[PDB]
Design a protein around this ligand. Structure first.
Ligand SMILES: CCCCCC/C=C/CCCCCCCC(=O)OC[C@H](COP(=O)(O)OCCN)OC(=O)CCCCCCC/C=C/CCCCCCCC
Ligand SMILES: CCCCCC/C=C\CCCCCCCC(=O)OC[C@H](COP(=O)(O)OCCN)OC(=O)CCCCCCC/C=C\CCCCCCCC
Ligand SMILES: CCCCCC/C=C\CCCCCCCC(=O)OC[C@H](COP(=O)(O)OCCN)OC(=O)CCCCCCC/C=C\CCCCCCCC
Lengths: 85, 79
């Protein structure tokens, strides 16, 4: 019962992300937070060039949830939807 | 758009999902595969070791006594 709800729960998270990423206040908040985390342990060592990785990939992740037609497919891709999205 | 409530709802859903063994299995299998290929294999050195350390810790965290508004305030999405 719990495990069969994982697909819908994942899709609900994706739906929330698609709404939030339409707010530039969301991008700014997450950028600023991750910029601070890149500068401190453990992330500064787990991800070399953390700030450069962030500068490149955060716009791409944001754009994915903003512009993809079917971002909920992520939930099938990560294995949480054994019967399809 | 209420970014604060949207963030709190994501946290609530994560706490439900992380209770399930099948969630841990699926995410681990997916990330083990990504650690072996680009881009993650280069972005995160010793990727599989980082996965083994932190996936349990993150799963346990969302199962513990957490404060969702404080978390969302920490990431800048709640006042
Ligand atoms: C103390 C805890 C620390 C744990 C963190 C340790 C490890 C961190 C690793 C993070 C860095 C890896 C970032 C990789 C992102 C990425 O590759 O996205 C690219 C891809 C592909 O983009 P393309 O346009 O096709 O082209 C790209 C190249 N051709 O972008 C996407 O498709 C978007 C999907 C990516 C989703 C990213 C996940 C973000 C969602 C998070 C949900 C919430 C998780 C909870 C976090 C709790 C943390 C305590
Ligand atoms: C943080 C990832 C952002 C994804 C999008 C966020 C969307 C919605 C918000 C969902 C909330 C889940 C994440 C909040 C968890 C969090 O980090 O806050 C708590 C914790 C503190 O907990 P503790 O002080 O130890 O325990 C007592 C207090 N709890 O905050 C932290 O400091 C942990 C920071 C870990 C950093 C994780 C790295 C981000 C991973 C993926 C981001 C992918 C984006 C692509 C860019 C790549 C950047 C390298
Ligand atoms: C985006 C999150 C929505 C689902 C929420 C479920 C809760 C947690 C999920 C955590 C795992 C992140 C989900 C992976 C996102 C994903 O599938 O993108 C795959 C992308 C390509 O995007 P696609 O659209 O599928 O194809 C491109 C063609 N357009 O490929 C990737 O590079 C994925 C890299 C994933 C890196 C994210 C790291 C997650 C951070 C912390 C996880 C917890 C600690 C463990 C860290 C170990 C990291 C080595």
């Amino acid at each position: 019962a719990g495990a069969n709800d994982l697909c819908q729960e994942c899709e609900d998270i994706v739906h929330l992300l698609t709404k939030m990423t339409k707010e530039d206040a969301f991008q700014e908040a997450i950028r600023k937070f991750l910029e601070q985390e890149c500068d401190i342990l453990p992330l500064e060592l787990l991800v070399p060039e953390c700030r450069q990785v962030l500068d490149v990939y955060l716009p791409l992740v944001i754009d994915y949830f903003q512009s993809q037609i079917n971002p909920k497919a992520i939930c099938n891709h990560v294995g949480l939807c054994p019967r399809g999205q």
